[PDB]
């Protein structure tokens with residue numbers, strides 16, 4: 064009756080990466096073969112598998128004897144974290160009708176049309192397919208969201224769960240939410256290969272890649288409550304994450320975007336002065352049904368270690384004390400609040416960049432934290448004075464400075480601390496690094 068017990072108990076395969084070696088830690092001890100070009104990259108909670116488009120980039124799981132036939136007629140669930148780069152507008156046109164498998168239990172080099180299951184991608188569709196020994200087929204075709212900023216197959220880590228109840232349906236869940244279904248009654252025996260293969264199969268795009276992590280198979284159809292628990296069990300709050308879902312790091316350029324106003328980029332009035340929000344330009348393609356606010360405009364920021372401490376980790380952990388800089392023209396300019404500097408009457412302190420008035424204390428110590436909204440890859444930043452008193456969470460305040468136009472100006476405010484359960488909050492920030500999985504069209 065413990066969901067954790069149930070999850071544990073029904074697990075019959077669990078790909079784990081430890082000491083740079085991939086193995087099955089289910090207890091079934093299935094043998095895992097890693098070919099030379101399967102790579103390891105940063106994942107959701109440790110390293111993940113990365114597959115490029117060549118023959119030597121694959122990971123094969125040879126089923127242990129005990130679990131060789133558990134999906135001929137039994138219910139099963141497959142789960143894994145998945146990361147797919149955003150498909151360019153030219154690649155949707157050129158390769159959009161090309162379906163390629165990434166994970167499959169179906170033979171193909173001996174038995175003319177492999178019965179079994181597979182996970183595939185086709186343009187912006189994620190496809191689950193079941194095929195019985197009579198060649199009968201059931202498919203779930205999930206069509207991704209047109210807005211690529213909020214979509215599931217657009218360079219962010221997302222959690223996939225597909226449950227198969229032989230008496231009723233197969234259901235596809237993304238980040239714990241039901242997004243696709245298919246009635247699978249009438250499917251007969253599902254008699255797969257003795258191998259589960261992770262590899263790009265039949266992909267015409269030579270530069271395509273995918274990343275997969277925590278590949279897991281359960282011998283039952285999970286219910287929604289078990290899936291929810293499964294999904295959140297991976298979200299460890301110890302390390303902060305960037306916009307793509309990877310570990311946030313020190314000494315790396317990030318473009319900041321407010322979670323509550325995702326249409327807005329950050330801009331600098333002048334060095335020594337304040338920051339404010341501007342509208343990001345957008346990309347629209349009606350014929351391909353794709354659109355998104357363009358990334359990588361606005362300020363670039365860098366996170367630096369407040370003190371060295373204990374051991375140098377490249378990743379930023381929740382609770383870390385840091386210093387934030389704006390990076391432009393090969394120069395770094397610290398972000399802070401000058402003692403007695405301009406602030407709104409309610410005490411929203413206006414943040415300043417490269418402030419350097421002689422004699423004036425400049426408050427720049429921050430704590431990088433995760434205070435809320437667990438499944439979202441966002442961060443909060445808490446500013447302190449020199450006595451280590453809270454100056455508040457970094458957020459924005461609407462108003463005007465001098466004769467400037469009215470703007471959402473970056474501030475630090477303690478007000479946010481009494482609203483941490485709200486749905487949407489002005490102190491949540493996305494940290495976006497330039498990445499090869501996302502190029503604006």
Ligand SMILES: CC(=O)N[C@@H]1[C@@H](O)[C@@H](O)[C@@H](CO)O[C@@H]1O
Nearest residue numbers: 386395396397398416417418427
């Ligand atoms: C030029 C500039 O913005 N300088 C800052 C400096 O003022 C100080 O805050 C330091 C942090 O210990 O980091 C930077 O070098």
Ligand SMILES: CC(=O)N[C@@H]1[C@@H](O)[C@@H](O)[C@@H](CO)O[C@@H]1O
Nearest residue numbers: 332336337405413414415464465
């Ligand atoms: C943050 C803030 O108040 N900035 C303003 C700045 O924009 C400018 O108007 C200046 C004039 O001396 O007064 C302040 O420094």
